[PDB]
Amino acid sequence: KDRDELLDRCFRCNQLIAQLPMAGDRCPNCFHPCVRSFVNFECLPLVEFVLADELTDEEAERIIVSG
């Protein structure tokens, strides 16, 4: 019986990580890599999203500043 407070939480799938993660430290459920700190290695509440092909990083910063 494992405690749930010491288990990593994948915020993308909104489900806990009970099994051992696969390569890349990805989520067992939704294959999401864990956005971890690099002192205590805790999965920070961050999800990774990539811009669509019609948006660029310069355009992403422009639309972030504008709205």
Does 27 show up as a binding residue in the annotation? yes
**Residue 64 φ then ψ, to 5°:** -65, -45
Cα 4–chain centre separation: 19
Site string for other proteins, 22-41 (x = CB under 8 A): -------------xxxxxx-
Whether 34 has a binding-site annotation, put simply, is no
Burial of 37 (0-12, 13-18, 19+ CB in 10 A): exposed
Between residues 2 and 58, which has the closer beta carbon with respect to other proteins? 58
Q: Are 25 and 19 in contact (CB under 8 A)?
A: no
Ligand-binding annotation for 13, yes or no, is yes
- Binding residues for Zn(2+) are 10, 13, 27, 30
Residues interacting with other proteins, by CB under 8 A?
11, 35-40, 42, 44-53, 56-57, 60
